[PDB]
Amino acid sequence: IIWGAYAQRNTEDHPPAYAPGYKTSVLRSPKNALISIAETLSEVTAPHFSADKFGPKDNDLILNYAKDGLPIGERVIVHGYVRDQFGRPVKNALVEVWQANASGRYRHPNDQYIGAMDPNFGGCGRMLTDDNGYYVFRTIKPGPYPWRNRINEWSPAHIHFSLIADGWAQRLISQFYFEGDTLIDSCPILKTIPSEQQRRALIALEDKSNFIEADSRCYRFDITLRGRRATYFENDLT
Amino acid sequence: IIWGAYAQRNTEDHPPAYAPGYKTSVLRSPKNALISIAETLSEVTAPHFSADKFGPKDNDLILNYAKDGLPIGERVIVHGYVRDQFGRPVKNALVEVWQANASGRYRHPNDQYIGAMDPNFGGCGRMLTDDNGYYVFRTIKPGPYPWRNRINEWSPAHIHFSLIADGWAQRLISQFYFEGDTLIDSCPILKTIPSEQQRRALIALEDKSNFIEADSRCYRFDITLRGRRATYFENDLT
Amino acid sequence: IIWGAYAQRNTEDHPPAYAPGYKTSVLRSPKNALISIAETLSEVTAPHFSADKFGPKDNDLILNYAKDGLPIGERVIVHGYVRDQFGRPVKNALVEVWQANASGRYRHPNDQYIGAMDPNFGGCGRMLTDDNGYYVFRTIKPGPYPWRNRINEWSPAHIHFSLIADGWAQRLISQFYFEGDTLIDSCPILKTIPSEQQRRALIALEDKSNFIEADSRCYRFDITLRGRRATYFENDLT
Amino acid sequence: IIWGAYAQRNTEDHPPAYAPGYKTSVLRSPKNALISIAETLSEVTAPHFSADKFGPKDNDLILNYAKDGLPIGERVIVHGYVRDQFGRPVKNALVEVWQANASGRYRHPNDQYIGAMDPNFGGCGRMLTDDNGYYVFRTIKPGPYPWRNRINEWSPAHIHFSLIADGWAQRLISQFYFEGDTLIDSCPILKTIPSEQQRRALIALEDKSNFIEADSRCYRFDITLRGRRATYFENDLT
Amino acid sequence: ELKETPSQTGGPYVHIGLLPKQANIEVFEHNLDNNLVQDNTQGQRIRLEGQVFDGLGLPLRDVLIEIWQADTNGVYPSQADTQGKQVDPNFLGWGRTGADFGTGFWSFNTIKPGAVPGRKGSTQAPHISLIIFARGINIGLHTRVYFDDEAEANAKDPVLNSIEWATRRQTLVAKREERDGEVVYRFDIRIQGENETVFFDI
Amino acid sequence: ELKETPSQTGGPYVHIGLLPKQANIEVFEHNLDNNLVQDNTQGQRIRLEGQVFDGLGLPLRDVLIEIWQADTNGVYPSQADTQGKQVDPNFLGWGRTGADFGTGFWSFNTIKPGAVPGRKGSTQAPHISLIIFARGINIGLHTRVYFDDEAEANAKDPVLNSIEWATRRQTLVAKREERDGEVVYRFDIRIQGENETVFFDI
Amino acid sequence: ELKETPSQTGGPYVHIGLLPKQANIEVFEHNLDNNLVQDNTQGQRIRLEGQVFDGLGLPLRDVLIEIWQADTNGVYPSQADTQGKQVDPNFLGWGRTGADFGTGFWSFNTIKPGAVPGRKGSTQAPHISLIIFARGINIGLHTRVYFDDEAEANAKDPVLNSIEWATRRQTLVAKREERDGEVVYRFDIRIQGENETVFFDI
């Protein structure tokens, strides 16, 4: 198999850069249209990270920052699969996540919300997907975060995530929500996504058969990245 | 009958000037709104072209550029009627058309697509509508054209057309497509039109009873221009 | 696994031999019913062809007959999978295809249609499916072909295909069409198939994510052959 | 306007020749398919009849055979328009009609039904359509006719008609029925027509606004013949 | 667009409307018939006759036949004829007849037509267009009658040459005979079975 | 009632159909062009030229322009003109041109039009109606060209006076120059940005 | 479960894809043909020939035929053959040919196959499996060719004995002839009518 370029990003499946309901995008969006280019080696390659550098608790947000006791909040496991758009597993991709604590408070110098800080919770983790594209991490369910877009804006509980996989063209940052959160229907950031089915693609589902008795609940969340086409005739990449 | 002004153009029935999905419109659209004016003789008059100047093959794209043989491709006749919005026939209007060849290749210095050029095909024609508003031309069905808007953009097979009729206010350029082409649902140029029923107005229909056995298929396509109102009281045009 | 016979051909899923709307079948169809037999080694074996004998351009109808330039017409890739009725891949099967050029003209001594011949196009190709049952070829999209059944009969654009696979009982010849072609609803040959869902099984689908920018479109078309049952008790084949 | 050939007859809109439910067609239908030909002057010409030869009562079946009094039965006027498939009027076409009397008895040496003969009724008439394609005749509504197909077969009330118009290709004989007759759903002759909408095309409609008080009812029945295509490029007819 | 009105059989009593004199109905002063020769008609007079047989080889005794043809110079007496030639003024070009109720024999008195232009500059061999209507026949059957003494023109005829089964071409050729100095062409039609007559969709 | 057919951009290859000679296609004997002056045309000859700029201030090198205007006495060569005056018989009143592919410059050879009646007894200042088509432009853009040496008539022009932002009126006034005894009017069009040219919905 | 892809006729131009040399297309270096005998092939050489006739008794001049058979010892050159015997290594077992466009004659050069095991311990008589494709034929027609000099094995053949109308068995037996020391088996196929060839659903 000789690989050709990644399939074109479907711009209709993503938010536009300029989205007035999300106020900070007004001054931070280009006025010119993006210039599309044909891909070269630059766009189809990406770095490789080795699991050797990762610590044992890097995917355990319940314990990786714990000092005198356990963080306060709902114990939950999140797992799923990362695949490309043609359904192939994405192997050894770097997944990084970050979130607020159970109060909806972020451990960040610029967050001043009164929701309480939890001395035993940090809010960041990372992992590499395995050969089946599977990933799993454990954490505390974050609380919803109030912020100033309109003055009483509240985002639904969410976990931010970033992926670095096989091609630079696949580079992606997004966030997922938890099934049933009523705030999902009002969030101006989620509403930058044009279509209803894509907004639904960011909702992690309750996975009841994977709950651990008297311990933790579990949510299922799969991620889809762009995929490369195979070449059978001319190979113009190079 | 004393004619008054043309009815106002319904802006909701046409694409907006600024349409970000069609990238080149971003820098080529006015930022100010159009200034509407009341019509004068300038807007309700238009030139007159005489059929005497037209060659015998001007409406025959199969033969008008043929040198050593016939062009390669699907033989098709396109006909229909040009009427104004009140249903009156538009008589002796100038219709000019242009299109790509059967490969989706245009005979133009700036087209570099690899689809092959056809030495026996030019791709342009013209005709005047008759007293019933009827027009007819014959051509080769064009192939779809790939272009760079997003990198893998493909337009459906189409024939571009221009009309110069009775009033300068009626001046119009557009393009029609062929019934059933799957690319119609994805074209970002066709999608600048806001409404579904107007997008459908650009689709030429298969006209099976007008096919010519062992020769050519046939498509039916009618065009509607703005129409003038009759005046029965004051005539302020002058 | 000990293989038994192929499952019986479902006669209701295929056209009948006598089909009066397709006139030439009237004198070329048996009047007696087919005699069904129980299978023997004769029916479950088939020849083997080696890829070694195939040329590099045998599956490239764009280049395999090209002399002074490229053929005129729409560049398209067609690919898909050949499977048996139990969903198993059909490996190393011989697929042969033939079609008209972009004018709907066949390179055959008996075709006299006026649609133009293309000196750089032949119209035949072949390939062997791989171990996953996958096949891929590139060609020019054929134009619809007018013929004499009723005098103004027109067949939709199509590519004829033949398969020789693992068992003689699987021997099959058919043709596929392209999604959206309006002529599909009128073809008397396609109408010999009794059911609507089987007529739909011959339509190749537009595969937009596999288009090659500024080069070729792509269609997906899968083929299903008869499949063998496994035996777990008596083996009467021999 | 230079006329080309008539549009092809749509065989799916007519009964097949072989129709076993109508028993006499079994030995009187060709076993070979019809051979379609391209039209010549022979097929597009037809004779011309002059109104001068027609008598004053030729379209009045109530009076044209009356000797000692008026025929017994329901006084009805039938009128309508004859048009071609493109909607153009068919001018000066010869329409001939024949039917049974009010008992369902035909004035024919071979009819032996016991329904009574009416000495003042003949059952035949003729007329030429005018320049708008309009025709009108007056008659007695016929009674349903029992006949031997299955032993208890009954045809709905009907009037047979024949047209000779502009081209020999248009030659047609058929029959129409009267709105509401319950026997229409059981007639094996009407059932040779494949589609429901075509069977409905033979039903004359009650035209209440054209009834003549204390005199006659009125039925509306339009007839559509094949139509010729116009030619704008080559004229191969000759 | 509209669909053509569907055809239906003429039935066994088609004589009432199209040949009333055969059904013994005297209602019209002028009756259409099978004699296409008027006193001043130009051309050689011929008689065309035969029978029509069903699938059991029996004659149809209720069949109605019409013919349409050009004059002696191959010009049709129709406004649709575009040759720009003058047609014989004493020639309708059409006639209608019914088979005899006892024998099934039918005939026409007409003249031998001249050759008519075919498509794209071709020339057709002399022929008469014929249509058959009857009980059991759902749609009138079209055929052509060519003449066995026009061997040379028949061999080059575009329509005959378009019948790919060559052995079937012979069913469209009538046989010339001379009965008392009268020229007769016998054309039997076989609707079904062996030697079935070619029928056209025109 | 019917809806007007929707507009679509002409695209980058509009020359094929409207200016084939610019696309190097010789297919017509008579080709529509940018020269409205015939040998016997009445009036003062002028040249109209300029460039069309996009939002980055760059010239459009694929734009197509047409103009429509009255003759020297302000009469349109159109049956719809109701003045009851005789129009110059050697004047089409319309022309078409394309910007040069390398520089973006366009021009027309025409004559200065006479004043045309406005609505309700008014008089319009001399002007040329112009329309622009090109890739990126979804609907042809209408504008007018007035002349800087007709200050007095411009000040009383009904259309210019109907633009409520007075500073924008100046974008419709072309500047007169004399190049070797030839009178030239320079009219640059700015589609977007500062000094954006007024466009009309007519 | 899936349904088998439906069959469609090969049409009159099937030569383009399956016998390009017959359509005058030289595109492949190696072309599949009707010669199953290689230099070292074992067995007695024979020629198989005949014509295929339609319902009017006329030969099909556009028919395409393929055969599939075992080697001289009754072993198929297929991985699906389970006899556990070594097959002739210089034998493909299959061939393809087309009838001549003018005469309708077809032929193959092959060898007489050995007897192949039948079901449940039976032995089949020597035979060749043949399939026919052509315009007018919606699904390839399967038949078998047996040899008239294998009377004894034919009488005990399970497939022939499964045809309940015994008179039809004879249509599957080809006739041996000797043309100049060459052994020829003539097998004519009759698609419809009297002596119609038995076709199998396999």
Add this chain to the structure above:
Amino acid sequence: ELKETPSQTGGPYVHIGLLPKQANIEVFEHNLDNNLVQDNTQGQRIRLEGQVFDGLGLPLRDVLIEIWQADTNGVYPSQADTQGKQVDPNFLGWGRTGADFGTGFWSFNTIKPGAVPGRKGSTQAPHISLIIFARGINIGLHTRVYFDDEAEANAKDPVLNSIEWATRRQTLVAKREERDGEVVYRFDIRIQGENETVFFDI
């Protein structure tokens, strides 16, 4: 087929997950950073620095930047690189940094990349691929950094030559400076407004 997961902004606290040390979170032993130069890394060392400005001309003080580049010989340290050359073994090719919360300044310590093959036999000019994430940015913005001392290679670069508005090409060229014998390339990014930086859909 599946649709790509939709993008969402990283938000103002993206440092927590991608640069925890900047958010004052010590949780990992090994932290990804902005230093791509290891002790044995080959090539000339350079520093890349600048700020990112919004539409009011103010620096973004919460932006996160990543770069991806080839080694000194133009080989990517990725299994997807098909050049068949050995890549520098002490080079990750990627780095990440955040703008300073007070000044908005960002920087990377890396090496100048070698030229990488372009499509169809072409050669691209040396460049670094860069992506920007931040509150207000819904989808990471891709751009490239070229070097002003590679004038000759830049003029022939396929990607730069594919930007049709030539004046915009200059926004992708960083300016070389020498600070104490250290080579520095200054690349300021302007998201919106005048001199807006070209962004690519890759």
